[PDB]
Design a protein around this ligand. Sequence first.
Ligand SMILES: Nc1nc2c(ncn2[C@@H]2O[C@H](COP(=O)(O)OP(=O)(O)CP(=O)(O)O)[C@@H](O)[C@H]2O)c(=O)[nH]1
Ligand SMILES: [Mg+2]
Ligand SMILES: [Mg+2]
Lengths: 470, 110, 23
Amino acid sequence: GETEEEKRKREFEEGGGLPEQPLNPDFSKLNPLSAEIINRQATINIGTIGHVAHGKSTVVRAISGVQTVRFKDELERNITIKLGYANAKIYKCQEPTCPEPDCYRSFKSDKEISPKCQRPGCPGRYKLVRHVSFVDCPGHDILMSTMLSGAAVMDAALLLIAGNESCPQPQTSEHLAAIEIMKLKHVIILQNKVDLMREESALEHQKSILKFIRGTIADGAPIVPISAQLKYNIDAVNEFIVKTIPVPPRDFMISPRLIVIRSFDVNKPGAEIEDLKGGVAGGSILNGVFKLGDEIEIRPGIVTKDDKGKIQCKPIFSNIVSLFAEQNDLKFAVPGGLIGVGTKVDPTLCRADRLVGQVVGAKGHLPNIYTDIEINYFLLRRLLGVKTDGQKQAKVRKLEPNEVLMVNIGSTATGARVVAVKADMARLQLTSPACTEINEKIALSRRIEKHWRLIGWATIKKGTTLEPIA
Amino acid sequence: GGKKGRRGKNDSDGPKRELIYKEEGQEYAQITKMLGNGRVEASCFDGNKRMAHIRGKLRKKVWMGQGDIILVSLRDFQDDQCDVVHKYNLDEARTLKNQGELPENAKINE
Amino acid sequence: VGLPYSELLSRFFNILRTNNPEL
RNA sequence: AGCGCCGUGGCGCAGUGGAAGCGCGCAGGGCUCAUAACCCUGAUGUCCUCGGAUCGAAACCGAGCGGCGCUACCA
Ligand SMILES: Nc1nc2c(ncn2[C@@H]2O[C@H](COP(=O)(O)OP(=O)(O)CP(=O)(O)O)[C@@H](O)[C@H]2O)c(=O)[nH]1
Ligand SMILES: [Mg+2]
Ligand SMILES: [Mg+2]
């Protein structure tokens, strides 16, 4: 007799609803597994990598249930530029009787804290063990800047390989090596095509996968069959996420910082402009804790060119009006998660792909912007992502002076020009300004086959500073 | 129409003729395409595409077009080519369609 | 180690075989 | 989601303030010994659906339906 919405509301109320975060909790006592932190904010960012026409948004919605938009009326089916966003709350069943593999379950953002166990015969609830944010990375040969920026943001990885297609996929190796660049070993390999794969052919494909990942830094990466259309084998993914991936070191003494990947203009059309909202910076906090109503500034900010050819950088000052997590308004920010900081920044400033991978620092801290950067780069022997028909896969050339190369400094995608080349170090001149705070591991890509190709990793060791104009 | 008609044989067989069946090599076929030099292409009801000559007593005596049922005599020495011998005027073709001497997958109706 | 892979793949195959006899 | 466009008789179009339109199709007839060309006559609607004024509505307008294009996926 009762409607299904009434049933869901009753379960939500019995499940504890969504407890509201305290206005000023004791910050030094909070951990990424605390109830006030875990109930409304994710703590681990898990990225998805895979070839095009393989299925990652389908896998994401199978795991989390939050769909990726796949927008712009022309990027709906082919590729996506901006990373996808998804949210899954990991739950475990307390009862010892039910088997461990199906104890875990990833539930949507609006799921209750203690929802009922959907398994027939088990009257138990669910315990929220971890909150994770699932982000889709673009696996396309030209789509590397966004992919590398996401990999920088990511704390865990999921590689997707199609069993029925060719066993060695060079774009998968590209993404795996890019993840190896940025010091991330928590990778869970997943086979997308298990429904349409034979008994011995699947074993051969798994053996080939094990053969491929032998010399790479990642060694004990778990490998798990999953389904994207039948939407099975999700609980094992939750178990492996909980076990193989521990909490990255991220606590409260570090200075507050933000790395914005995407920007949104909050202005609903049709309704009169009298009721509008400011500008949203979609950023991950790799370090620091934020609250409601803080004072921040985007260090690279506005880029302008004078009549004399000088690059002026304006730090975009902004008061944080609010911070939005996946579900509702929060009062404090847990480090290591993607958050939409809705500030007084112009919605016009957050209109296009403008605030794509830019660093933001709170007032009382001075990240340093640079024009010429003294970098230390390491290359690989062979280019990854090239499909050669059985003859000596592409060989990496040493970088030449006065060559335009795409450098992803943690989040900033800049076209650097080589000033000089040394045995292991180089000088890069940037027309687009970029910052440096502590390390900001750098991904290097070269234009060889008409598109950006990853060549190796690099680290900033020095830079020619520029003093921003207030 | 024209003054040609009075020069003709005046062979008026308007009444319903008795249709002729297939005899030891004579087989039914369907005109697929019209070619030049008084020659046609006939898809026979055996999965083959034979080249059928527009033949004597038939050249300028009856006028035949695309998609016409036809009776054609083969040649044992050369199977590829054959000769159109008789033409059925779309009425007894229906009768053969019900009796099904030809596969019914070849449906040609006005 | 690929030990957790084999059991999960076998469970997947059993589920597909039972739910979809046409395959 | 908003805004711009539209609402065949089979298709492309036209006037929309005075009531069924043209052309191209289709059917029949005519010219020609014969065909095409050409000429003549039709047989097809809810000029999308619900209302307001009006001798009059399809228009003029509004209380909506459906399809296209710009903003563009508008946390
Ligand atoms: N039959 C079958 N189809 C699958 C499976 N997994 C994914 N797909 C197909 O993937 C297609 C698109 O998935 P999607 O995740 O959106 O593409 P994508 O991999 O993100 C594109 P990019 O790699 O550039 O990001 C779906 O239509 C789906 O049919 C699978 O396991 N079986
Ligand atoms: Mg996606
Ligand atoms: Mg006579």
